[PDB]
Write a protein that binds this ligand. Structure first.
Ligand code: MG
Ligand code: MG
Lengths: 408, 408
């Protein structure tokens, strides 16, 4: 009747690494990816840092034409998805392609393309807008491109819950396999919104840190936090039914056991001040997984480094899980990957379970006095992690929590 | 263990009506919504028609200041949502708010806002980008605005499969209630992309009809079809478990019984020439509903009026359903509402089952010689409709099919 759901591989491009080995190395050792902005001229901006991918392995899978067929938002998903397929030793050729699906979340899609073609419209007129603008820009197209690359004829969609997009995507694929609609899913998220428009937009909202020191801008839970630092990239996971994974002899890396999604229905960008909605989302994940709060050995926080977010998030972790469970935010390393956050953080959490190590929150040196969660900083912590959760809480009130079980 | 899922109300703004009465009456008397473009200066464009909402009842629920928190894409969903709540006699106050959720699909989100704010960033610099830009423009925000309006603290998300976005949203809420995760869902789609940039974008793709005669531009299945006509607006439905509907004494309008979603994985900008993916999507809906091809009494087609689409779509309907079943595309009335298409077309289908009536395909006078489906045109058809389906097939390969059962 119900299926267990297993992770058999994943792939990633991020500001701290473009392979599994490099990614985990950064997390284990403490190599951050925040630095000065180089993708555009930022002299008139108040923000001067971001977590860029400054070594994208374009030549591994793409040729020169591909920089024009695809916006970066699609390029990152495609790279990560191929890496995930390779990592899983998945042979696309031997699958029932009708039971093989794709979900690629994105917050904003090909925003660089939109911005550039809008400007070109106003200055040269409509006969001059490029024919593939919308195929490259629309937020659903990455998922279609991934489906085309691997002949996935099953489910194909995108999901948008802003910062929660990837968490909900994985939860959705999770539910899809658990209830027998698919046997294999490539799922995750991608974002490439380090652009003048997207940065100006979050700057106008006051959500971005203006701190000049790149070692001090993304400091989740810290006393002196003053906004997030935008990152970019993609993470993609291969999920399978346990049955399907075991019937081809896959190496199983981990298991997805719980998913909870709620809505603050409070305010458009401001999170609930005591994390009321987050509280319910964590409980729903634990309930589906049928575990108790005490079994949660690690929490990968949303932890964006905003004054309001960590107040309520700490408050919510404490009310459900207590003040002993280790908590860290890797947005201190990767920046805030927006719609890709969840995907990359699911990988962080899976790697943490496999390597018996809670990565630290980088940069953070002193936590606010009202924050009661056991925020890990200064150095990560060695321990057994049988179960873990990863939080995301987007603009528009979207709360999403994933619960994972270590594979034994 | 499994719940039945029932429709208790619905709301709509569209180019043919802003109430279920006006909207239907349009379908019954052959009044189309296609006309000259008035929203912007289109003199340099090759396309001069669209299906605009030129009588939006803004004063019913809003005030002038609301244009500052909401782009039209949000405004249309919020109106349609309040109308659906009214139609269903739903007291938001008396619900278990944690089992009440919202899904609002959109293909492009608040593209007008993005376009305008991009231009202003270029003319005047980043100090001048408006604080509310992203909260108004990001495609997930409409779903969050609806959740805030009604205190929905359950599931909240947005889904993006381009032209199938609303079908997938309703399929999703359907599955959410069927499997016991929610008891009540407001679900549908919205779009407001009749803007210079979005129009220029589809024009450059070549997907838009350039026919001068508004009366002849959106002509699904017709031998002279030459592209679609963009529309705008929102359809929202209230879905409830049958059990929850009955306990409060609600009037049931219809029932959702089947959902199928596949992917062509063929080409980004054109459907499979033989509709192979559409074929499988229809079968999956019938299988979940546990009905036979003979029990389908009406097909509300995707039927965009694109040379490519109706070839494969007719092929697909014939190959699974035969040449007898009545088929019509209401995009001949409403235009192509993109991400809102499925929501509005679900309403069309539900209404057709309640009036015993298949609306015609307007404008269409002669079908292509190779098209074998029973395309209803010239006039509608009186008949019993115990079951129906509604198709959407979007750019990127996304196939989605909803199967509905008449209520008695
Ligand atoms: Mg997290
Ligand atoms: Mg339809």
């Amino acid at each position: 009747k119900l299926n267990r759901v297993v992770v058999t591989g994943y792939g990633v491009t991020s500001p701290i690494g473009n392979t599994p080995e490099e990614f985990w190395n950064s997390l284990a050792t403490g190599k951050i990816g925040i630095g000065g902005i180089t993708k555009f001229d930022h002299s008139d901006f108040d923000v001067h840092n971001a977590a860029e991918i400054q070594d994208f392995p374009f030549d591994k899978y793409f040729v020169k034409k591909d920089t024009n067929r695809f916006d970066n938002y699609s390029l990152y998903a495609l790279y990560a998805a191929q890496e995930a397929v390779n990592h899983a030793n998945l042979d696309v050729e031997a699958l029932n392609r009708d039971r093989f699906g794709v979900i690629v979340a994105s917050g904003i899609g090909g925003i660089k393309e939109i911005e550039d073609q809008v400007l070109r419209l106003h200055e040269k007129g409509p006969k001059r807008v490029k024919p593939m603008t919308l195929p490259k820009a629309l937020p659903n197209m990455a998922s279609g491109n991934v489906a085309m690359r691997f002949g996935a004829n099953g489910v194909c969609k995108s999901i948008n819950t802003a910062c929660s997009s990837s968490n909900d995507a994985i939860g959705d694929a999770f539910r899809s396999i658990k209830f027998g609609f698919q046997d294999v899913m490539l799922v995750g998220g991608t974002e490439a919104s380090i652009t003048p428009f997207a940065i100006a937009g979050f700057q106008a909202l006051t959500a971005l840190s203006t701190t000049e020191d790149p070692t001090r801008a993304s400091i989740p839970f810290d006393k002196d936090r003053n906004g997030f630092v935008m990152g970019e990239g993609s993470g993609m996971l291969v999920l399978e039914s346990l049955e399907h994974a075991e019937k081809r002899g896959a190496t199983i890396l981990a298991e997805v056991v719980g998913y909870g999604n709620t809505c603050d229905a409070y305010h458009m960008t401001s999170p609930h001040p005591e994390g009321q909605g987050a509280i319910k989302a964590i409980k729903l994940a634990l309930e589906e997984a049928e575990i108790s709060p005490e079994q949660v050995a690690y929490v990968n926080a949303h932890g964006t480094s905003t004054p309001a977010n960590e107040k309520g998030e700490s408050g919510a972790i404490v009310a459900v899980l207590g003040k002993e469970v280790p908590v860290s935010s890797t947005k201190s390393f990767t920046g805030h990957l927006l719609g890709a956050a969840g995907a990359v953080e699911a990988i962080v959490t899976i790697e943490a379970m496999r390597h018996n190590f809670v990565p630290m929150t980088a940069g953070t040196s002193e936590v606010s006095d009202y924050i009661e969660a056991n925020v890990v900083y200064g150095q990560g912590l060695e321990k057994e992690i049988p179960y873990a959760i990863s939080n995301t809480f987007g603009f528009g009130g979207h709360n999403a929590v994933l619960a994972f079980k270590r594979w034994e």
